[PDB]
Design a binder for this molecule. Structure first.
Ligand SMILES: Fc1ccc(NC2=NCCN2)cc1
Ligand SMILES: Fc1ccc(NC2=NCCN2)cc1
Ligand SMILES: Fc1ccc(NC2=NCCN2)cc1
Ligand SMILES: [Ca+2]
Ligand SMILES: [Ca+2]
Ligand SMILES: [Ca+2]
Ligand SMILES: [Ca+2]
Lengths: 304, 304, 302, 304
C-alpha cells in the first residue's frame, strides 16, 4: 500500500503518522505540510520531530501553501500549543538536529506522485488547501490516486472550532468543497469529528497515551497532554482514527454510511458538512473497532 | 515593456491580443489560458488562431486550470459562439494547422516568468483563476511582478448605479478576492466593466470592426459579428480597453480614481465587488481617450 | 383559450407561466415537466414555486421524462442556478410548503387531455422529449391539439446571432424531429432563440425585471438577476416571448415567415435545424411587438 | 419462468412463441406487438393466429406503437408475405374466429408488469420501439426486469435488410440504442442475425419445418415456406433461436462472447451494431446446440 500524507502536524497528526510508520504494509512516499493548527514553519519542524523520534527520517517532507485558499487566519486558541506540538522540549527527544525540507512545492510534488506512482493513496489530516490547489491545476493527475482518506467534517452538524464546523473544513471550506466536487466521493472515506467524539476515550480509564519507557511513549504522552486537557480529559483521536482506517481497511470499521457531502460556504454555519444518503457518495465511517484501535497503538509503543 | 497575458480567448480578448502585437514596444513573453468565455481547449485554439492571423508564433502558449476554483463553468456560447471565437472557419484564414501548447502548466510558467524576467507586467483578460493559484503557491514570485492590468469588476457608474453584466470576477469571485488581497492594489490598474459599458460604440455609426481587404480585418470582422449582434448592434470593447490602457499608459487614461477593491463572497450580492475611495487602492480607470482608441484599432487593421 | 404548458421551469419559463396566469382569457389545464434547465425534481419544485407566488394552485402538475430520448445525459446545467430558479430563498416568498404533483405520467396525462378537452392548445417551453413520446405512443390523440406554440430552434445562416445559444432542440434533437415530422407544421408557431436575442433588452436601460412592492415583482426580479448576469447584462426573453405569442397572437407578431423546419441529426451540426421557405411550414416569428411585450410584463407585475 | 414477449407476429416470430408456449415451465404473462415486418394490424392478427393454432388464447395481447421512433416505416419486399404470416389461409387452420386484444397500450402494460411481476424476463423479437419508450417513460420500472433476451443486431457487421444492418435494429436504430444504453448490457443476451445464419439449415437437407399430421405442423410448414425460399432454400431461425436461448438458456448456448454493443445512427451503415470486447456487455451467443434445438422443435410438433 502506497500512501501520501498531507498534514498540519499538531499533536494528533503526529500520532497518525506513527500509526502509518509502524505498519510495514504501508510505504510513506511523501509528507506534505500546510499551516492549520500552527504555521507552516512549525508543521514542517513537527513532521521532522515525529520522523526523528520514530527513527525513520527517510520520507521526503514537502512544504505546501502558506494560507487557506481564500479564507482569512481568523482567531484561534493555541489548542495544539504555541509550537503546534504541545510545546515539547527537543532535548527530551534528541531532535535539536537540522530539519529536512524538499525543494519542490508540495502541490507540484503531489501532482508528480499522482502521475508517476501506481495505486497511490492519500491520507489528508489537515485543511484541504494543498489538495484543492492540486485538483485545480491538474485534476487529471490527482484523479489517478486510488483512494482518499480524509479527517474532516461532522456529518451531524456538530463541529469543534465552531458549533457547526469541524476545524479542517472550517479552516478552508473552499478547499474542502473543491475536493468533494472534484475527486469522486465514492472513492473517498471520511473520519469525521463526529466519529472522533463517538470513539473518544476518558483519559482516566485508558492509559495508552500515558506511558514512559521509550521515546515513542514519551513523545505520545507529552504531546497529547495539553490537548487531552483541552478536550476535557477525553482522548478524541481524530487524525489517528483516520490513519487507523487508512491502514487497516474494513477491519478498522465497525459501521459506516454512504453519504454525499457538501460544504456550507456562507453564514454562521460556514464550514459545516451537509450530509445526504447517496450510494456513490463518501464512506462516512460511523463507528470504529476501538479495541483493535487501542491494540495497534499499544503495539507501536511496545519495547519488544 | 515586457508583458504577460492571461486570457480566456474569446472575441474581445483576441482583438486585445492584436493590440499588444501591433505595438512594437511590447514584448509578449507568454500567454496563459483559462476557461472563461469558453472551455480551456477552445481558448488555446483561439489564441493560436489570433497569433497565426497576425503572423507571430514566437510567443509561448500555456494551458492553465480546467475550471473556476469553486463556482461552475459559466461558458457563454450564445455570445462568443460555440468555439468561443465566433465560429470562424479556419480554412478561410489558413489557421487549420497544428496548435502550439507548451508542456509546463501556466501557473508554473507564470511563477518562473515572475522569477526570471525583470520588469514583467501582466495583463489579465479573464477570470483570475490562474493568477490566484500562482499567488497561493508562490506569492513571493508573483509579487516580483511590476504591475497588474486587470479587466474585471464593476464599480459605481454615472448616477451611482453599477451596470449589470460583469463577467470576469463574477465568474470566479474567490480568485479575484485572492488577487485583490495578495497582490498590492497600488500596483494594480483596473479596466472595469463600468468603463466598457460607458465606452460602447453603435456599430452602425462606427465601422472599425467591419472593414475588409486584409486578413486581420477579415479576422476582426468575422469574430465580432456574433457579439455585436448579441449586443443589439453595439460594440462593447472590454478587453481592448484593458489592452489599450496597459499598452498606451497615461495617453490612454483621461480620468481615473484610486479605489480599494473587495469581492462579496457571501449572500445575495456574491460576485459583485466593493469600492471605497482609497489612495493605496487600485487605479480604476474612469474615462479613456476614445479617439485615440479607435485610431489604434484602425491602425492595427492597416495594410502595412 | 385552453392551454397546456410543457416546461423545464427555469427562470424564463416561470415568467412565461406568469404571462399565461395573468391573462383571464387563458385557461391553463395542465403543466407537464421535463428535465432540461435543471433536474425534473427541481422543475416540479419550480412550477410549484411559480403557482404559489401567483396564487393559483388549481392547476395539476405532472412529471415527465428524465433524459433526452437518444442523446446521452451530458450532465445537468446551471445557467439557471443550482435549483433551476436562480437559487432563490423560499423563506422570502412563503413557498417553503409541500409541493403538488399528480400521479399520472406527463405523457399519459397529456394524451388524456388531448383526447378529452376540446380546442386544446399547447405551449412547449423545453426539450420536446415528453411531446415526442406522447406523439409516438398516441399520435391520433396529440394530433387533436388545435395548435403548437414552441420555444426552440435558431436560425443558422442569414444572420449574425449564433445558433449556439439554442438549447431545447439541441438538448433533444430526436424529440424535435419527431414533433416536426409528425405534428403539422402549418399548425405550429415558433418562438426561436434567434428571436430571443433579436428582441432582447439591455437591462441597464429597461428596469421592468427590477421592481419591488409585491411578491410577483420580487419573484421576477430575484429569479432573473442571475440570468441577466449571464447574458452580459441583457434580458433575452426566450420563453416569455413564446408565451407572448401564444396568448396575444397576431397582436404579438411584428414579422414572421412560413418555414418548413427539420433537424440535423448527424455530423458537426447535430442539433441544428434546416429552414426552407414553405407556406405549409411553421409560422416562424422574426420580430415581436416589443412595446406591447413590456406593457404585458409590467401589467402582470401590477 | 415468467416471460414477456415483444414481437410483430412474423413467420419466425410465431415459431418462437410456439417454443415458449410448448414449454410447460414458461409462463407467458403478456405479448406486446409492434409494427415490424408488417403492420401492427397484421401482427395482432398473426399473434392471435399462433395462439389459436396452439390452443391457449389465455394470454393477453397488447398493441403498441405504430411506427419507429424517428425512422420511416420501410418498403417491405414481402419477406414474411402480405399478411406477415406467410399468406396462410385461415380456413386451412380454423383460426377465422374473433381476435382478442387488450385495451391498454403495450408500453403501459409492460411498465405495469415490470412494476408488479416478480422475476420478469422479456423476449424481444421485434424492432425495439415499445421497449425504448417504456424505458424512456419509466426506467425505474423496466430496470426491475430480471433479464433481457433480444433477437437483433449482427456483430458480423453483415445484416440482411441492409449489408450492414440486421432488420430489427435497422428498422428502429434509435430504439435499439436506447435499450443498449439504458438497460444493463450485462443482464442482456443477444441472438444476432450472425447467430441465425451460423445455425442455419438447408431445407433440402432438413425436414423439421416440413411435417404433417396436425394443425401445428401444418402451421409451421405453411408459414415457413415463402421465407425459407426467400433465404434461398435455407432456414435461418432468428427468433426461434432467441426463444431457444431464453427458454433453455445455458442448456443451448455452445459458444458466446461478452461484447459491448452500440448503434450506428447515420450514414450507409445505419442500423449496424458495433461490438467491442467488454466483460460487462451483452452475452452475444455465437453458437447454440443445433441438436437440442431441433429436438425441442420436434417435441412441440409431435401429436399432442
Ligand atoms: F476547535 C477545536 C476544539 C478542540 C479540538 N480538539 C482536538 N482536535 C484533534 C484532537 N483533539 C480541536 C479544535
Ligand atoms: F448557452 C447559453 C447561455 C445562456 C443563455 N441565456 C438564456 N437562456 C434562456 C434565457 N436566457 C442561453 C444559452
Ligand atoms: F431483410 C431480410 C432478409 C432476410 C430475412 N430472412 C429471415 N428473417 C427472419 C427469419 N428469416 C429477413 C429480412
Ligand atoms: Ca490535523
Ligand atoms: Ca476575456
Ligand atoms: Ca424553458
Ligand atoms: Ca421478429
Amino acid at each position: 500500500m502506497k500512501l501520501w500524507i498531507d498534514t498540519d502536524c499538531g499533536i494528533d497528526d503526529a500520532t497518525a503518522i506513527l500509526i502509518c510508520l509502524a505498519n510495514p504494509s504501508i510505504e510513506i512516499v511523501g509528507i506534505s505540510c500546510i499551516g492549520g493548527n500552527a504555521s507552516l514553519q512549525n508543521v514542517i519542524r513537527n513532521v521532522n520531530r515525529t520522523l526523528k523520534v520514530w527513527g525513520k527520517t527517510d520520507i521526503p517532507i514537502f512544504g505546501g501553501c502558506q494560507a487557506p485558499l481564500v479564507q482569512p487566519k481568523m482567531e484561534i486558541p493555541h489548542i495544539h500549543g504555541g509550537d503546534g506540538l504541545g510545546d515539547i522540549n527537543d532535548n527530551d527527544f534528541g531532535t535539536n538536529t537540522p530539519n529536512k525540507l524538499e525543494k519542490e512545492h508540495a502541490v507540484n510534488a503531489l501532482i508528480h506522485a499522482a502521475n508517476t506512482i501506481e495505486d497511490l493513496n492519500i491520507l489528508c489530516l489537515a485543511p484541504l488547501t494543498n489538495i484543492a490547489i492540486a485538483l485545480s491545476m491538474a485534476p487529471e493527475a490527482i484523479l489517478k490516486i486510488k483512494h482518499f482518506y480524509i479527517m474532516g467534517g461532522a456529518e451531524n452538524g456538530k463541529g469543534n472550532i465552531t458549533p457547526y464546523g469541524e476545524f479542517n473544513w472550517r479552516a478552508d471550506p473552499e478547499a474542502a468543497q473543491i475536493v468533494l466536487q472534484t475527486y469522486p466521493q465514492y472513492q473517498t472515506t471520511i473520519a469525521s469529528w463526529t466519529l472522533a467524539v463517538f470513539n473518544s476515550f476518558n483519559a482516566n480509564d485508558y492509559d495508552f497515551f500515558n506511558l514512559d519507557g521509550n521515546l515513542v511513549r514519551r513523545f505520545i504522552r507529552e504531546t497529547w497532554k495539553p490537548i487531552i486537557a483541552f478536550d476535557g480529559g477525553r482522548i478524541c483521536p481524530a487524525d489517528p482514527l483516520a490513519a487507523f482506517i487508512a491502514v487497516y481497511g474494513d477491519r478498522a470499521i465497525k459501521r459506516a454510511e454512504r453519504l454525499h457531502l457538501s460544504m456550507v460556504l456562507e453564514g454562521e454555519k460556514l464550514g459545516m458538512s451537509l450530509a445526504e444518503p447517496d450510494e456513490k457518495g463518501c464512506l462516512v465511517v460511523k463507528e470504529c473497532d476501538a479495541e483493535l484501535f487501542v491494540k495497534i497503538l499499544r503495539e507501536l509503543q511496545d519495547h519488544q
